[PDB]
Amino acid sequence: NFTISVTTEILPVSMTKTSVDCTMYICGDSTECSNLLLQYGSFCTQLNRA
Amino acid sequence: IYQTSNFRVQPTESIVRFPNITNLCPFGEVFNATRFASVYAWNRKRISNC
Ligand SMILES: *[C@@H]1O[C@H](CO)[C@@H](O[C@@H]2O[C@H](CO)[C@@H](O)[C@H](O)[C@H]2NC(C)=O)[C@H](O)[C@H]1NC(C)=O
Ligand SMILES: *[C@@H]1O[C@H](CO)[C@@H](O)[C@H](O)[C@H]1NC(C)=O
């Protein structure tokens, strides 16, 4: 004799599509901070691309 | 689709809120007086509410 047993199997497929902006996070909406951040270079482009 | 910047709304005006009193603090007697006690026993001038 045989039995049929349904088995559940869970698999994550995706996570939340987050996004981070420097001048909002790195700078508290200031101006001099923006000057210094643009002085540091192109880290923010790399972060946004990633 | 590209993500370039953030929709930032600039502030309109500059509100300033300071207490409404007009008592001048006595800095003149503090900076220059007839006698100042020496280092072994120095005084405390508690400037408050001016
Ligand atoms: C195979 O197994 C099933 C499940 O146990 C059997 O079905 C049961 O049979 C008994 C009596 O034989 C009943 O009292 C139950 O109500 C049945 N259960 C269900 C879910 O139908 C089936 O009889 C077995 N087959 C053989 C040839 O033994
Ligand atoms: C300290 O000097 C200033 C300068 O004129 C004067 O107005 C003030 O009365 C002086 N403070 C004193 C003498 O305690």
XYZ file of N, CA and C and ligand atoms in Angstrom:
342
model
N 0.841 -1.187 0.000
C 0.000 0.000 0.000
C 0.879 1.241 0.000
N 0.303 2.358 -0.436
C 1.033 3.608 -0.590
C 0.229 4.752 0.008
N 0.921 5.825 0.377
C 0.291 7.044 0.864
C 0.887 8.237 0.132
N 0.060 9.247 -0.116
C 0.493 10.488 -0.748
C 0.522 11.579 0.311
N 1.668 12.242 0.446
C 1.884 13.227 1.502
C 2.358 14.531 0.878
N 1.496 15.549 0.903
C 1.888 16.868 0.423
C 2.880 17.479 1.399
N 3.995 17.979 0.873
C 5.035 18.595 1.693
C 5.232 20.032 1.229
N 5.173 20.975 2.163
C 5.452 22.359 1.818
C 6.960 22.596 1.776
N 7.370 23.507 0.897
C 8.788 23.832 0.757
C 8.898 25.305 0.390
N 9.459 26.101 1.291
C 9.510 27.552 1.151
C 10.866 27.949 0.592
N 10.874 28.943 -0.301
C 12.106 29.404 -0.902
C 12.014 30.909 -1.107
N 12.899 31.693 -0.501
C 12.956 33.121 -0.819
C 13.374 33.334 -2.264
N 12.791 34.361 -2.877
C 13.016 34.615 -4.294
C 13.564 36.023 -4.481
N 13.189 36.935 -3.588
C 13.629 38.314 -3.721
C 13.538 39.010 -2.374
N 14.306 40.083 -2.240
C 14.267 40.951 -1.077
C 13.795 42.343 -1.495
N 13.704 43.243 -0.520
C 13.175 44.576 -0.772
C 14.158 45.393 -1.600
N 13.652 46.030 -2.657
C 14.475 46.867 -3.530
C 14.718 48.203 -2.836
N 15.709 48.211 -1.949
C 16.043 49.414 -1.206
C 16.848 50.372 -2.084
N 17.026 51.594 -1.587
C 17.799 52.608 -2.286
C 18.247 53.657 -1.282
N 19.503 54.084 -1.406
C 20.121 55.017 -0.473
C 20.702 56.184 -1.258
N 20.473 57.397 -0.763
C 21.018 58.609 -1.358
C 21.983 59.259 -0.375
N 23.184 59.592 -0.856
C 24.215 60.208 -0.026
C 23.779 61.523 0.603
N 23.486 62.518 -0.239
C 23.270 63.875 0.255
C 22.114 63.942 1.241
N 21.210 62.963 1.199
C 20.179 62.856 2.220
C 20.687 62.181 3.486
N 21.572 61.194 3.351
C 22.060 60.433 4.496
C 23.396 60.975 4.994
N 24.382 61.065 4.099
C 25.705 61.547 4.482
C 25.628 62.986 4.977
N 24.817 63.811 4.322
C 24.600 65.194 4.724
C 23.208 65.364 5.314
N 23.133 66.060 6.444
C 21.859 66.510 6.962
C 21.424 67.751 6.213
N 21.000 67.555 4.958
C 20.527 68.571 4.008
C 21.248 69.910 4.159
N 22.570 69.874 4.292
C 23.387 71.071 4.411
C 24.114 71.354 3.100
N 24.815 72.487 3.068
C 25.544 72.922 1.881
C 27.040 72.648 1.963
N 27.685 73.016 3.073
C 29.115 72.757 3.225
C 29.408 71.263 3.196
N 28.543 70.464 3.826
C 28.681 69.016 3.743
C 28.633 68.538 2.304
N 27.767 69.134 1.483
C 27.728 68.774 0.071
C 29.045 69.107 -0.615
N 29.630 70.263 -0.290
C 30.920 70.624 -0.870
C 31.984 69.595 -0.513
N 32.057 69.211 0.762
C 33.063 68.234 1.179
C 32.812 66.868 0.544
N 31.543 66.459 0.455
C 31.225 65.167 -0.140
C 31.596 65.124 -1.617
N 31.332 66.203 -2.358
C 31.808 66.269 -3.737
C 33.328 66.373 -3.805
N 33.968 66.885 -2.749
C 35.427 66.877 -2.712
C 35.981 65.466 -2.565
N 35.293 64.599 -1.818
C 35.790 63.236 -1.632
C 35.856 62.472 -2.950
N 34.846 62.599 -3.787
C 34.937 62.023 -5.113
C 33.648 61.308 -5.499
N 33.815 60.203 -6.226
C 32.718 59.483 -6.871
C 32.362 58.188 -6.150
N 32.415 58.175 -4.817
C 31.922 57.016 -4.080
C 30.417 56.859 -4.239
N 29.693 57.977 -4.302
C 28.236 57.930 -4.337
C 27.722 57.332 -5.638
N 28.391 57.621 -6.755
C 28.019 56.986 -8.015
C 28.181 55.473 -7.929
N 29.276 55.012 -7.321
C 29.480 53.580 -7.131
C 28.391 52.979 -6.251
N 28.035 53.668 -5.165
C 27.010 53.162 -4.257
C 25.657 53.061 -4.954
N 25.284 54.106 -5.697
C 24.016 54.091 -6.415
C 24.008 53.013 -7.488
N 25.130 52.831 -8.188
C 25.202 51.783 -9.198
C 25.051 50.404 -8.570
N 25.698 50.178 -7.424
C 25.584 48.890 -6.747
C 24.152 48.625 -6.302
N 14.916 53.594 -17.055
C 14.680 54.526 -15.959
C 15.989 54.781 -15.225
N 16.266 56.047 -14.932
C 17.433 56.437 -14.157
C 17.004 57.179 -12.898
N 17.858 57.118 -11.880
C 17.660 57.852 -10.633
C 18.811 58.838 -10.489
N 18.505 60.131 -10.596
C 19.522 61.175 -10.635
C 19.642 61.943 -9.324
N 18.533 62.453 -8.802
C 18.560 63.273 -7.597
C 17.259 63.043 -6.836
N 16.966 63.929 -5.888
C 15.765 63.851 -5.072
C 14.977 65.145 -5.205
N 13.649 65.035 -5.165
C 12.804 66.218 -5.259
C 12.886 66.999 -3.956
N 13.784 67.977 -3.903
C 14.074 68.720 -2.685
C 13.385 70.077 -2.741
N 12.565 70.364 -1.736
C 11.863 71.638 -1.642
C 12.658 72.552 -0.721
N 13.142 73.663 -1.267
C 13.939 74.590 -0.485
C 13.058 75.353 0.504
N 13.592 75.692 1.674
C 12.812 76.463 2.645
C 12.476 77.850 2.118
N 11.318 78.349 2.550
C 10.834 79.639 2.069
C 11.523 80.795 2.786
N 11.386 80.860 4.109
C 11.957 81.958 4.880
C 12.829 81.436 6.013
N 13.238 82.322 6.918
C 14.126 81.979 8.027
C 13.487 82.450 9.332
N 12.677 81.582 9.941
C 12.117 81.887 11.251
C 13.229 81.920 12.287
N 13.180 82.914 13.167
C 14.110 83.005 14.286
C 13.296 83.208 15.554
N 13.594 82.423 16.587
C 12.851 82.472 17.841
C 13.831 82.532 19.002
N 13.908 83.689 19.642
C 14.735 83.950 20.809
C 13.839 84.459 21.926
N 14.230 84.252 23.184
C 13.413 84.758 24.295
C 13.275 86.272 24.236
N 12.087 86.761 24.599
C 11.773 88.187 24.496
C 12.096 88.890 25.815
N 13.392 89.101 26.031
C 13.896 89.890 27.149
C 14.993 90.801 26.618
N 15.242 91.910 27.318
C 16.258 92.867 26.890
C 17.112 93.346 28.057
N 17.576 92.425 28.898
C 18.430 92.759 30.032
C 19.884 92.511 29.654
N 20.701 93.559 29.720
C 22.108 93.442 29.359
C 22.869 92.714 30.461
N 23.649 91.708 30.079
C 24.451 90.985 31.051
C 25.632 91.840 31.508
N 25.968 91.792 32.798
C 27.048 92.643 33.343
C 28.436 92.073 33.077
N 28.878 92.187 31.822
C 30.218 91.730 31.467
C 31.287 92.729 31.891
N 30.913 93.998 32.075
C 31.900 95.009 32.416
C 32.553 94.773 33.765
N 31.747 94.483 34.790
C 32.311 94.220 36.109
C 33.070 92.899 36.130
N 32.657 91.944 35.294
C 33.337 90.653 35.243
C 34.724 90.800 34.632
N 34.821 91.506 33.503
C 36.102 91.607 32.810
C 37.082 92.494 33.566
N 36.600 93.600 34.126
C 37.473 94.554 34.802
C 36.783 95.061 36.058
N 37.416 94.841 37.207
C 36.908 95.321 38.482
C 38.077 95.784 39.336
N 37.745 96.393 40.476
C 38.776 96.928 41.359
C 39.687 95.829 41.895
N 39.108 94.708 42.322
C 39.875 93.624 42.923
C 39.404 92.288 42.370
N 40.356 91.437 41.994
C 40.090 90.050 41.630
C 40.791 89.134 42.623
N 40.049 88.170 43.161
C 40.639 87.188 44.057
C 41.625 86.308 43.298
N 42.641 85.830 44.014
C 43.730 85.109 43.375
C 43.329 83.665 43.072
N 44.305 82.904 42.566
C 44.038 81.559 42.064
C 43.654 80.600 43.183
N 44.241 80.752 44.374
C 43.949 79.809 45.449
C 42.493 79.872 45.890
N 41.811 80.990 45.644
C 40.386 81.105 45.943
C 39.779 82.031 44.892
N 39.260 81.445 43.820
C 38.651 82.195 42.733
C 37.131 82.114 42.805
N 36.485 83.145 42.270
C 35.051 83.340 42.407
C 34.290 82.767 41.216
N 32.986 82.587 41.415
C 32.072 82.118 40.380
C 31.063 83.220 40.101
N 30.996 83.665 38.851
C 29.990 84.633 38.420
C 28.964 83.877 37.584
N 27.771 83.688 38.143
C 26.708 82.922 37.492
C 25.836 83.882 36.695
N 26.113 83.988 35.394
C 25.329 84.865 34.537
C 24.068 84.139 34.093
N 22.908 84.708 34.422
C 21.647 84.005 34.222
C 20.564 84.964 33.751
N 19.808 84.534 32.738
C 18.584 85.202 32.291
C 18.828 86.677 31.964
N 19.671 86.901 30.961
C 19.955 88.242 30.475
C 20.390 88.154 29.022
C -4.165 1.805 2.009
O -4.149 2.839 3.012
C -5.348 3.625 3.075
C -5.107 4.704 4.105
O -4.786 4.149 5.373
C -6.529 2.723 3.415
O -7.728 3.487 3.466
C -8.351 3.246 4.745
O -8.952 1.942 4.797
C -9.557 1.637 6.062
C -10.047 0.211 5.979
O -9.242 -0.565 5.103
C -10.671 2.637 6.359
O -11.212 2.368 7.649
C -10.134 4.061 6.306
O -11.201 4.991 6.455
C -9.421 4.312 4.980
N -8.840 5.645 4.957
C -8.921 6.458 3.899
C -8.264 7.797 4.049
O -9.497 6.128 2.869
C -6.644 1.622 2.371
O -7.695 0.727 2.720
C -5.333 0.849 2.270
N -5.417 -0.164 1.231
C -5.161 -1.459 1.449
C -5.298 -2.363 0.263
O -4.836 -1.879 2.555
C 35.152 98.121 32.776
O 35.556 99.000 31.720
C 34.459 99.511 30.947
C 35.058 100.335 29.832
O 34.599 101.679 29.878
C 33.520 100.315 31.843
O 32.397 100.739 31.080
C 33.058 99.468 33.022
O 32.298 100.265 33.925
C 34.255 98.873 33.756
N 33.813 98.003 34.833
C 34.012 98.274 36.127
C 34.737 99.553 36.430
O 33.628 97.520 37.016
